[PDB]
């Protein structure tokens, strides 16, 4: 970076170069890459944070529920081949959002919570 040796208790090593805590910054926004995430992105000769990397080079997808696009930086729920906007990952019956460890069934592209599988299938199929 500043091309000067640090002389402190803690320093960083990235892209076969040594850096300060303050010197290893994202080339686009200037955020401290060490405090923000344990990894940096290296594209077109630039050291980039995840956000700027994904906004610029990320791959978008299609939501299995709403059929609208999902931008690369959007939070998602991956289930087998399918991908959902986090807000679309909800039970088709009760419209309830889930918790880690909860049980749901995947029918086609429908997410139906466990409690609801019976009544939903009874009504819909």
């Amino acid at each position: 970076g500043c091309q000067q040796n640090i002389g402190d208790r803690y320093f960083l090593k990235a892209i076969d170069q040594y850096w300060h805590e303050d010197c290893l910054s994202c080339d686009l926004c200037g955020c401290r890459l060490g405090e923000v995430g344990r990894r940096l992105y290296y594209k077109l000769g630039r050291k980039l944070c995840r956000r700027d990397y994904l906004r610029l080079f990320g791959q978008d997808g299609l939501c299995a529920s709403c059929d609208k696009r999902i931008r690369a930086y959007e939070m998602t729920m991956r289930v087998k081949d399918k991908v959902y906007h986090l807000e679309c990952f909800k039970c088709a019956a009760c419209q309830k959002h889930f918790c880690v460890g909860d049980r749901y069934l995947l029918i086609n592209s429908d997410i139906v919570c466990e409690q609801d599988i019976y009544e939903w299938t009874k009504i819909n199929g």
Binding site: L40, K43, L54, T76
Partner: peptide, 29 residues
């Protein structure tokens, strides 16, 4: 066919593995 809810993940986060570089924190004296 009955599944368990996992953690969310970012959309393009699967795709940018090649471009990911690791930051090593080191010690002195």
């Amino acid at each position: 066919d009955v599944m368990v809810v996992g953690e969310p993940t970012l959309m393009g986060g699967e795709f940018g593995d090649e471009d990911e570089r690791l930051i090593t924190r080191l010690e002195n004296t």
